[PDB]
Amino acid sequence: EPSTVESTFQDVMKSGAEGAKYVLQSLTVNSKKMYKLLIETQMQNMQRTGVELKLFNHLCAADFIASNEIALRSMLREFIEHKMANITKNEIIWVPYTYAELEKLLKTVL
Amino acid sequence: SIFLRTKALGALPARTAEYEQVMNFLAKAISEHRSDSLYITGPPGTGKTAQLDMIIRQKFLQNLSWFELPDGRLESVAVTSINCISLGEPSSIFQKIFDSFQDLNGPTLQIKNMQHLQKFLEPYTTFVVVLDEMDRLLHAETQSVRTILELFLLAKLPTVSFVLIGMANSGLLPQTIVFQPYTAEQMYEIVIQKMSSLPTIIFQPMAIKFAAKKCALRKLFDVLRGSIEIYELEKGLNYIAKVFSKFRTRIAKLNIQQKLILCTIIQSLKLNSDATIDESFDHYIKAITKTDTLAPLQRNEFLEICTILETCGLVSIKKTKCKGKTKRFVDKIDVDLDMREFYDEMTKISILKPFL
Amino acid sequence: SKFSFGQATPRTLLGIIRLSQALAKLRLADMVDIDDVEEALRLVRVSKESLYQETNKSKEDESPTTKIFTIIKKMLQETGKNTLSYENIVKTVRLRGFTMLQLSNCIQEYSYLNV
Amino acid sequence: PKEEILNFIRKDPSNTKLLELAETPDAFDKVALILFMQAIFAFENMGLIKFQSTKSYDLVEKCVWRGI
Amino acid sequence: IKSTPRRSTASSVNATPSRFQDDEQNAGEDDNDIMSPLPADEEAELQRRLQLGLRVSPRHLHAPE
Ligand SMILES: [Mg+2]
């Protein structure tokens, strides 16, 4: 017997592909532009280690999105709560996610 | 006065895309007498509670009214409002619904769970409930999702008539509707729609456009209200810019003596990573002795300078443990400022160089 | 540190003497001057600085307020009082070469922060 | 087999959702993953396999040997 | 046309918005006064207007100041 009744009591499907799309939908317009530049820079060479701390500030110099330099902590503490940009300073960040399903996320946010 | 009524301020403005989707859920549950559960999510400030309260206060046994069907009929619809955070226990949410529907003249029965609440809605009448903030109903995975799972099963089985409309905060699944936040053009229409009852409008068309884009609804109300209190305390386009600026600066507000200790705090965290208050005091003393400038301070008065940085918002002092052989509880020191603004304010005085 | 070389052995001290004595033979001089000692010590510093890069920065030409602050440190070393009446520090600034107008602006600046 | 799996899932014309999934080129890679996840969890409830960490789910161990 | 017009015309940006300047209005108002005597690409001008943040004082598509 395949056991269909007892199989609905455990987490069979078990960092959130469909859950990350609902987070960006509830955010503002300027909040989605901050995550779009981080994905394009990280998925450029999957052998790039990621986006450095001062590297993210260089993207704001070419596109007026944030305010200044002290406003970086206001957006960094919110992305780490939804599990989307893990830190790994040897500050180089890298989220544990492959580029197989990450390419489809750029079409939804566009 | 026109300044007193402006600061105090069924289709809501900038919400016609979600108002029709909400009324469509009730067109199939009251007309066909089918039980279903609704789920509403979104960030705080999208006007979720203001949208549901406007429908009840317009187109809607105590608490009995009449609802107008699209084709043209009449039915006894009972609508109530019960908040989840305004309760004592999450398991006692079934008793509050009974007190809001049953009349006070009849007998008051006690409800324990689902078996005592389903039998009451069997003979009956569309019971509409508005459970605000359903995210607090969990017990802070098996025992946590118990009140939500029980209330969802009560509004899914037939033979009864109980609808559930919840407003959370960001084959029997509820219809999820994501509330989109207000943008620049959406926040501007609500301002003119809310202040439409006023005879004279003292606001400028170019000032509301700046506050609508900089705040992208509760944050916009505090900006417009602050401009009226500021203008009335000193006696336009510049009125909207003063509300965003009055609410590098934390460094200039300190003295020259407090800047020397602060410069040694970030210096000890670079060559030692995790450091405590006892280790930071020894590094500051040995750093000022080679220069032979300014008199040193004792360890008792060393905490007075660090208290100024904590109140302003530059040094965060927490309580953690150690990582060596003597892993005991000790007070660790940490910072939360940027290195770009730190290496630019102290360099303008041209009096300190080895301390940076 | 990472560039941990050898210890200051006494054999390295005799090497500077042999290098300074060999430099005097090329100049046909029976006495070692000061230029022979500086030339012999330069060859040792060059061989030791081969690991470091060619990036050297030095700047020490700020406002003259720092030079006046050094005179105040001499009074605190002998006594150690932060009083407002300063009649002995003015006599030391005049002997240096600074004017009396710029001295009054430096004392008022330090008195505001209580130094 | 790939030809027998696609031909069996298309024998139910009443279900319109079963014919839409078989039209995708990744249909054989998705059906085999569903049956594999149902058999893996069925083996853990009986005590055949064993998981390592809780927030990992990447390696499985053996705890039942036939013959002993 | 880049080592001199990029610096001379940058001083007029601090006094052009009466100080909020939108990027949509730059292609409708400055195209007949600044972009007409000095031709430049629309994509290349976006990086020049965004590089003003390095000077602290001249700070979405809007340019607050
Ligand atoms: Mg609310």
Curated annotation (Swiss-Prot), chain A:
Subcellular location, record wording: Nucleus
Coiled coil: none
Domain of life per record: Eukaryota
Additional remarks: Present with 1700 molecules/cell in log phase SD medium.
Quaternary structure and interacting proteins, as annotated: Component of the origin recognition complex (ORC) composed of at least ORC1, ORC2, ORC3, ORC4, ORC5 and ORC6. Interacts with MCM10 and TAH11.
General function of this protein: Component of the origin recognition complex (ORC) that binds origins of replication. It has a role in both chromosomal replication and mating type transcriptional silencing. Binds to the ARS consensus sequence (ACS) of origins of replication.
Family: Belongs to the ORC2 family.
Protein name: Origin recognition complex subunit 2
Organism: Saccharomyces cerevisiae (strain ATCC 204508 / S288c)
Gene name for this UniProt entry: ORC2
Curated annotation (Swiss-Prot), chain B:
ATP-binding is among the record's keywords: yes
Origin: domain of life: Eukaryota
GO cellular component terms listed in the entry, alphabetical order: chromosome; cytoplasm; DNA replication preinitiation complex; nuclear pre-replicative complex; nucleoplasm; nucleus
Alphabetical UniProt keywords: ATP-binding, Cell cycle, Cell division, Chromosome, DNA replication, Nucleotide-binding, Nucleus, Phosphoprotein, Ubl conjugation
Example of a GO biological process term: cell division
Induction field: Transcribed at the end of mitosis, but in cells with a prolonged G1 phase there is a second burst of transcription in late G1.
An example Gene Ontology molecular-function term: ATP hydrolysis activity
Residues annotated as signal peptide: none
Matches recorded under SUPFAM superfamilies: P-loop containing nucleoside triphosphate hydrolases, Winged helix' DNA-binding domain
This protein's record includes keyword Glycoprotein: no
Similarity remark: Belongs to the CDC6/cdc18 family.
Subunit structure: Associates with the ORC complex and the MCM2-7 helicase complex. Interacts with CDC4, CDC28, DIA2, ORC1, and TOM1.
Cited PANTHER family: CELL DIVISION CONTROL PROTEIN 6 HOMOLOG, CELL DIVISION CONTROL PROTEIN 6-RELATED
This protein's name: Cell division control protein 6
Source organism: Saccharomyces cerevisiae (strain ATCC 204508 / S288c) (Baker's yeast)
Originating gene: CDC6
From Swiss-Prot, chain C:
Domain of life of the source: Eukaryota
Compartments, as annotated in UniProt: Cytoplasm; Nucleus
Chain residues that bind ATP 2: R11
Misc note: Present with 166 molecules/cell in log phase SD medium.
Purpose: Acts as a component of the MCM2-7 complex (MCM complex) which is the putative replicative helicase essential for 'once per cell cycle' DNA replication initiation and elongation in eukaryotic cells. Core component of CDC45-MCM-GINS (CMG) helicase, the molecular machine that unwinds template DNA during replication, and around which the replisome is built.
Protein family per UniProt: Belongs to the MCM family.
Self-association and partners: Component of the MCM2-7 complex. The complex forms a toroidal hexameric ring with the proposed subunit order MCM2-MCM6-MCM4-MCM7-MCM3-MCM5; loaded onto DNA, forms a head-head double hexamer. Interacts with CSM1 and MCM10.
Record's protein name: DNA replication licensing factor MCM7
Species whose genome carries this gene: Saccharomyces cerevisiae (strain ATCC 204508 / S288c) (Baker's yeast)
First and last residues shown, out of full length: 677 to 791 of 845
UniProtKB/Swiss-Prot annotation, chain D:
Taxonomic superkingdom: Eukaryota
Cell compartment(s), UniProt: Nucleus
Coiled coil: none
Family membership: Belongs to the ORC3 family.
Summary of subunit composition and partner proteins: Component of the origin recognition complex (ORC) composed of at least ORC1, ORC2, ORC3, ORC4, ORC5 and ORC6. Interacts with ORC6.
Role of this protein: Component of the origin recognition complex (ORC) that binds origins of replication. It has a role in both chromosomal replication and mating type transcriptional silencing. Binds to the ARS consensus sequence (ACS) of origins of replication.
Protein name as catalogued: Origin recognition complex subunit 3
Species in which this protein is naturally found: Saccharomyces cerevisiae (strain ATCC 204508 / S288c)
Whole sequence portion shown: 549 to 616 of 616
